Design a binder for this molecule. Structure first.
Ligand SMILES: [Zn+2]
Ligand SMILES: [Zn+2]
Lengths: 156, 37, 177, 71, 146, 94
RNA sequence: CCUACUUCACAAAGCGCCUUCCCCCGUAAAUGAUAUCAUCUCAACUUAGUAUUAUACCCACACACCCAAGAACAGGGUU
């Protein structure tokens, strides 16, 4: 099965060896414990979170403003918990959900600051030489949310 | 040389050689046999 | 982080000087690398209107290598505009005339065909040989890896490597060779 | 320089990425007419000439002098 | 290897000849290539492999002597031509544009003055079609024409 | 003060001198200004990164157009880090 | 370009005079393998074999009048 060392004898990409599962689990536990201790001792400043709200993912931090393109059935000034957090990150560590982080880990809270309409959007249809011309003006409801705080808990 | 679509050796000393990208029939005895593809 | 606004913006949008070594490299692969850098498509802050291109200094453009018979078959066509002014020149002749034109034209073709292309080409610095002007050398920041790894010659292989490679066959002793 | 680790349940990935400082040894000590004008500017800033020519009053008046500012 | 020496009187002496390395990975094969498991795993730049079938002045060795297959002899001959034209055998010479993967002899090709339309483009050959069956380590097949 | 920068609110002069004063209060030797990264030094648009080192340890590095500006900005970054008014500090709690 | 001649006449012209500089490649060879001869070689290699046009030309940043400069403008001269 041995092949002499030629240009095409081996794949160009470097060979990859799977680490032994015992050492992999040991290293995983060590890293998780280190990050959990950082969370316990509060060794982090600002937190950012990627949160799935409405239909989209928002990269979010405390004091941030977010413009949802629909009405939310919430009074202005009402506080809310954004429950679908995909990612939370600090300066020195990040936590990734698969695909979502647990409710125990992260708590992202927002506040309905504004309920508005968008500026008028023009929908015009035109087809040449067909007397085909149509115009419509649409205003989309919108809600401005302010992200008040992102909290993480040592539940790793 | 005579331009031929198909090269055919005529006598024994007619030899095919691929030179400057194309086939030729050269011949020392009978230069009349010179052919070019 | 924790920079002031103006220094932060300056750092983010500063233009870097890259160095490509064209020795034995395909001009097209050199041009791909250089065109990416010149556009700024290697920066996550890239935008077509942000003018985020970088400087590319390509040296040894005289020693580029064409694969195949491109030296003889690749033809560069130009027209002076006057009747009878159509000129067609092979890659080898163009290389002998201008040891920079081949890489320059490859990069020019790979760049987007808009009004930013010649500004981008202003940030391209081509030098036929190992010599580079002192100010450009002082500007240099990073050197990009050569896209094509140069194969070794037997004259370059070490006797240890030759011994390590096995002998493939037994030549008959009674052979002239 | 990133440490990746699934949690024990395998439902969250934990990434440890401390910021690495630049080693002291990897640092150096601090050292102690219209035509010709446009050519000089183009050479200085590695641009083309076209940028430095003026624009008409129509374009100049079209430019917004109070643009919105974010952050 | 026998060599002829002159002094006039000339005589031929058999000198040291290398032997096949011990323990072929696949003994009892047709060609040395099959014996050493190299059917589709060498290229024009594998000079260590190629020079083992090369006369001291650069010429190829005959298939009868080498024991190579017909297809493998053709592949080795073409790879050696490409290596010579790329300058990878500077010492195997009879007695400046860098190239590689050159199928044709440089003086025998004509410039492509009129490359055709898109559907009938005249392409520049690269490499050799003999190596078309080599091991493919890339998502896209390697192109023989540029 | 949300979104405001420390020295956008507190105007200072000679941040390097002020940093030296603070390090003296902390009984630390004056930091060594040292050029960590640079780009296009001979052009009209240079980029310099200057780092202030305390006993071969980087305390803060800052960018600039000239080496002096980069050093001054590195001093400002060092002051922000010492005072805990970094950009990525814990947000105010409400 | 205007010395003569000629049309002509402080100049413009020809019918007059002066000056004009390098090649391209089809093939023919040398050594020589695949294919131990041979073989000009889309084998490696060595020549005829040359365009990588050689040059030449041009190159001063900053009223008025006259002009061989000129539609205007521009250009040249005004010691
Ligand atoms: Zn004949
Ligand atoms: Zn076989």
């Amino acid at each position: 099965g041995y092949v002499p060392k030629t240009s095409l004898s081996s794949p160009p990409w470097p060979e990859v060896v799977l680490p032994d599962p015992v050492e992999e689990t040991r290293h995983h536990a060590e890293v998780v414990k280190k990050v959990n201790e950082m969370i316990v001792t509060g060794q982090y400043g600002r937190l950012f979170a990627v949160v799935h709200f409405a239909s989209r993912q928002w990269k979010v931090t405390s004091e941030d403003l977010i413009l949802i393109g629909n009405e939310l059935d919430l009074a202005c000034g009402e506080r809310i918990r954004l429950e679908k957090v995909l990612l939370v990150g600090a300066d020195n560590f990040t936590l990734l959900g698969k695909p979502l982080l647990g409710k125990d880990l992260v708590r992202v809270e927002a506040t309905v600051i504004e309920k508005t309409e968008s500026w008028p959007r023009i929908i015009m249809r035109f087809r040449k030489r067909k007397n085909f011309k149509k115009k419509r003006i649409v205003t989309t409801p919108q809600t401005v949310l302010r992200i008040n705080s992102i909290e993480i808990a040592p539940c790793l | 040389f005579k331009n031929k679509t198909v090269l055919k050796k005529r006598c024994k000393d007619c030899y095919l050689v691929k030179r400057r990208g194309r086939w030729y029939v050269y011949c020392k005895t009978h230069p009349r046999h010179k052919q070019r593809q | 982080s924790s920079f002031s606004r103006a220094p932060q913006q300056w750092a983010t949008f500063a233009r870097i000087w890259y160095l490509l070594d064209g020795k034995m490299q395909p001009p097209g692969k050199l041009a791909a690398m250089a065109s990416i850098r010149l556009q700024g498509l290697h920066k996550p802050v890239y935008h077509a209107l942000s003018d985020c291109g970088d400087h590319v200094v390509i040296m040894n453009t005289r020693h580029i290598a064409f694969s195949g018979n491109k030296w003889e078959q690749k033809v560069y066509s130009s027209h002076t505009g006057y009747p009878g002014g159509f000129r067609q020149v092979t890659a080898a002749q163009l290389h002998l005339r201008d040891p920079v034109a081949i890489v320059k034209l490859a990069i020019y073709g790979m760049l987007p065909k808009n009004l930013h292309r010649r500004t981008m080409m202003e940030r391209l610095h081509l030098f036929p040989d190992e010599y580079i002007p002192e100010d450009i050398l002082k500007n240099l920041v990073e050197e990009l890896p050569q896209p094509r790894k140069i194969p070794k010659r037997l004259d370059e292989y070490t006797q240890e490597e030759i011994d390590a490679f096995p002998r493939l066959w037994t030549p008959p002793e009674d052979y002239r060779l | 320089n990133v440490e990746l680790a699934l949690t024990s349940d395998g439902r969250t990935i934990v990434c440890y990425h401390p910021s690495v400082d630049i080693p002291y040894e990897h640092t150096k000590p601090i050292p102690r007419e219209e035509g010709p004008m446009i050519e000089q500017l183009s050479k200085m800033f590695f641009t083309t000439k076209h940028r430095w020519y003026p624009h008409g009053r129509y374009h100049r008046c079209r430019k917004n002098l109070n643009p919105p500012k974010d952050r | 290897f026998r060599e002829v020496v002159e002094t006039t009187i000339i005589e031929g002496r058999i000198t040291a000849t290398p032997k096949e390395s011990p323990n072929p990975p696949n003994p009892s094969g047709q060609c040395p290539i099959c014996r050493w498991n190299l059917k589709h795993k060498y290229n024009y730049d594998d000079v260590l492999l190629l020079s083992q079938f090369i006369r001291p002045h650069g010429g190829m060795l005959p298939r009868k002597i080498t024991g190579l297959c017909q297809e493998e002899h053709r592949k080795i001959e073409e790879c050696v031509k490409m290596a010579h034209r790329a300058g990878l055998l500077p010492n195997h010479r009879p007695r400046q544009l860098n190239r590689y993967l050159t199928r044709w002899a440089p003086g025998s090709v004509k410039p492509i003055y009129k490359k055709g339309p898109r559907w009938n483009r005249v392409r520049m050959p690269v490499g050799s079609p003999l190596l078309r069956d080599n091991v493919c380590y890339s998502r896209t097949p390697w192109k023989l024409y540029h | 003060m949300t979104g405001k920068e420390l020295f956008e609110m507190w105007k200072i002069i000679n941040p390097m001198g002020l940093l030296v004063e603070e390090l003296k209060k902390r009984n630390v030797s004056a930091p060594e200004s040292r050029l960590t990264r640079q780009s296009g030094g001979t052009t009209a648009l240079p980029l310099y990164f200057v780092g202030l080192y305390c006993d071969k340890k980087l305390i803060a590095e800052g960018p600039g157009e000239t080496v002096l500006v980069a050093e001054e900005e590195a001093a400002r970054v060092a002051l922000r880090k010492l005072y805990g008014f970094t950009e990525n500090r814990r947000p105010w709690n409400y």
